[PDB]
Amino acid sequence: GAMGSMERASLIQKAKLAEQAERYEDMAAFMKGAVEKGEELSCEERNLLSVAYKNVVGGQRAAWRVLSSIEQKSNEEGSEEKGPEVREYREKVETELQGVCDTVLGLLDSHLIKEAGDAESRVFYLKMKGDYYRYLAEVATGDDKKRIIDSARSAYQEAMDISKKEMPPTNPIRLGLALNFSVFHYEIANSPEEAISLAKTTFDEAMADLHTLSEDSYKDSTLIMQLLRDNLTLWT
């Protein structure tokens, strides 16, 4: 790997610089290098990893949606034939997106998840696993779509089970996991009722535990609670 010659600490330093410069592809490449050093990641380092890839894949997903919409319009009655270019370019973006997802999943499988014993790290990585299978599901149309969806579901479910046993209902990782699994239910699994139930129960259980928190912890928990409320408002 091109980052094999760079010190772990230098990769982490450069990932932080890349974030400040909004150079998310670089940030991701640095963090991939850091993971491949083989040591476990700290909380801060896990956040760098997630932020980098979230931003890279987020841009790819937005581009894919633009292109997919153009392609769908091209296949409506009365649309003039314009050749294979729209499909080709959507496929190009799609393939690059799938590559990024496969890269992230690969890091999780080799060997972040298996070495993660503390609840906070394990849930964090399993949420990522669910998320990147969800992004694969968004673009899947073939024989494997069901298995991809199930892979996302299974990862999210393992994370939910650990989070419920080991973390308070206000923990931001637990909250963000539930937010995302709820979106999985609504957008991927065709289960809007399950999505709405999960978001509501998560919100209400967090509300009940806010009294235990410091001002700073309260800030983080309430921010995610508002995202839950925002989705509920969208869906009801």
Binding site: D131, L179, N180, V183, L227, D230, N231, L234, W235
Partner: peptide
């Protein structure tokens, strides 16, 4: 699109 984190 709905919110995720």
């Amino acid at each position: 699109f709905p919110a995720t984190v």
